[PDB]
Symmetry: C6
Subunit: 187 residues, 6 copies
């Protein structure tokens, strides 16, 4: 919509790295998620195919291997890492409407961003066991009889976007560490 | 659309907690509901599967176990808890166009928000019997013969978003209580 | 879109009840209709199921029991009850561009709103025979042989939204009567 | 979008009837077409059902009885009757950028509107043979063998909106005639 | 969106015909393409029906008779004929930021518009062999065995919009020729 | 949305070629991608047809021949080549908020655009083996038995848009080289 003025206000009140590179890599991730990836995952369940005649086996096997979709995880991650930047916008506006205080908020603000980014990257790793999606999954949850072969939709294209989102997120961690280091030695 | 100016007007005329944390957690819930959850529930009935040949058994079993969808309940809840904030906006503008009066409205306004939030959380608990969705439901409503097995779509992902929305709502109750307590002891 | 300025202009030039409560309950109904209800009725015909092999029996039985959908009726009702408020906006602007006259328009304007609201509530009652939707309908229109059982989609959730819309409309009638009574005794 | 300023500019430079009633009834028709009717006709071909096994008979029978959809006819009609109002907006702005001339344009402008409205109403009558839609159509175009029964989707609801659009259009003809008569006797 | 100001800027810096009639007929074509025609072609391949059991015959026969859809051709045509008008907007703004020059650009600008309009009309004629769409096409491309009958979706309605778009385009050619002739004799 | 002001700000601070031709060819590509091409690729997997009875063979053969869709590749390319233009907008605004420096940024900025455009064109060539899409693909990945024939949806129309996007991109490379050459000889 009119997001230009929102980030425009957030654009000020930041250092060299904070003003430029963090905000660029952030709208970078939103664009990838919105204009490209969301239609890769559009038919994730409609094109899941299992080799069986058992009613209900398809529902339980899809639910077992994809407890939460990748794009829903990324959407949550962006919301979490964008709130601490939004808090200082209101907190500063609150204090300007009517160094140490603004220092502690700002230093804390970038400290949460590192925590959230590392947390979600960890969840991606354990939940999906690496960053590569397989063509074939074997499922033996009830009511599937014995073990059933099921086939994933578009596994290669989903791997490409997964690697891309992880790499950009890994960079944003490094930038946030350095800006912390600049203030740390400054004392 | 242009929601920035609406909440911007609502942003003023509030205390420290009211200005910042309540409004942040509120747009937090709207974002979760809009950008993420609404497509989790998109195929709730299209992917409901029952193990039967009886015509019409699928319609009555879905209707029996989901009398109203989760996302419709959350949409109603947000509308209810946002009106009392909107009433004071017009009521104040009405009184400014032409302490005690504004006190009683404001104290009452936050009193309704606690009532609505507690009411909807109660409905969630009794209607759905806890906050965890099951893979399998057993149904014996007419015309289903004897008891029929039916299978839910995406039960695990729906559980994740249910726990998330309940937790955020539970926090908003605590914040509203404290702001009431601050005024209560102030007398 | 940019509806804030439209109702903002309509917000002025009204009494205490007219400025606040009528306009709040009005955008209340629009929100319920738009963000929640329109996807409850999305699959009204696609999930209508009849127990027969006769080609064309499904089309005629759906058409017989739902001559016009509930959401289309509500959409028409909102359009009708919002025009008399829009007429005075242009009529006043026409008279201000170049008491009794403005009195008669305003008193008439609220008189039509009562008429339309009562009319549509009456149509809801006779056309659908109460405000509760049934799970099963029996149909014997040609070409269905003898009597055929057909099953409605999501009957319970549609009942909840029907009761909600009727109740809010019933309140708007009471508010309009009182504002008429205030002017009536004023003479 | 931002249609308020467009019609706002068109709102001026008109007489009592032209300023108010014509423009009100015009946006009235647009609202009916947009917010209500366009989803009545959404499944016009997907739910057309024919009692046959002949491949291709459904395509030719739908095309034979609905040479052009009702909503496409109404969309064309609104575009045609709105251009002459838009022409004077540019023509006047052209003459103001750098009585008789403006008289002849204005009198002609309302003369075309009567012609277009009467023309489209005539097409509706002959093409569809009255304003009532039937449940059953019989079709014998090649390749259908002998005569085939086909069934229309939502015939009753489409009849309601057809009568509504014809009635509003018939009123707009009467208003345009009277404004012509006022100028005619004025000489 | 906010197209009013774009064409508003383009509205100036043109002659009598160029200011009024060309720009009116241009937004005329955009409206027809957007609000009406794009849903006529929505199911062009989903409702293409072939009388065969050969897998893949439907894909190759649709691709053979519709190498590029009509609406995609019209969308390209509008983009091409609108760029030369946009070039002078930037070129003039470039020259005004810091007769013969502006003459040569303007005369050339209208010369390209005639070329593009005539080119696309020629492509329509040879590719589709006239402006009338047929109900039945016969196809013998591999892997279809012998010759297969296939049936087009909504052939009559597509013919109506094809004739309409060709006629409006043919008028825009005539207007551009005359404005060229006015400058030609002027010397 | 409101993209006019964004590129309007980017419109300034550029040379003759940079201001006009690069930005025109850029929004040219966005329009082709958005309004035309995205619905050519809409049914890419739904209309992929394979001549087999083996469950899961369709999923693996589609994934093998289309590791990433063409429109997703183009969407990524536009995002990459538009960031370096956006970086200087913030970097300049950063330096103006509080020759050589601005020279090095600008010269570097156009140097990355050439790199990205050449890189993506290379990926298109090797991944899809030329710019022409075939009607028939032969697939022997497990679990398909022996070799299976599969048929692509709309191969000819996809070839037309592929050639169009490659040609426009090839021009943007040439323009960027020349602007580099103008500065190079200038020293």
């Amino acid at each position: 919509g009119t997001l230009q003025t929102i980030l425009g206000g957030v654009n000020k009140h930041s250092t060299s790295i904070g003003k430029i590179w963090l905000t660029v890599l952030f709208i970078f991730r939103i664009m990838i998620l919105v204009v490209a990836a969301k239609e890769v995952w559009g038919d994730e369940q409609a094109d899941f195919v299992c080799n069986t005649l058992q009613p209900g086996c398809k529902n339980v096997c899809y639910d077992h291997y994809f407890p939460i979709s990748h794009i829903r995880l990324w959407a949550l991650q962006l919301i979490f890492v964008s709130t601490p930047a939004l808090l200082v916008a209101m907190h500063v506006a609150y204090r300007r409407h009517e160094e140490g205080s603004l220092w502690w908020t700002y230093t804390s603000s970038i400290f949460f961003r590192v925590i959230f980014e590392a947390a979600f990257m960890y969840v991606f790793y354990v939940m999906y066991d690496g960053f590569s999606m397989q063509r074939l999954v074997k499922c033996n949850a009830w009511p599937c009889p014995n073990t059933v072969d099921c086939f994933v939709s578009r596994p290669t294209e989903k791997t490409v976007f997964t690697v891309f989102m992880i790499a950009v997120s890994g960079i944003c961690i490094l930038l946030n560490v350095t800006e912390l280091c600049y203030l740390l030695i400054r004392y």
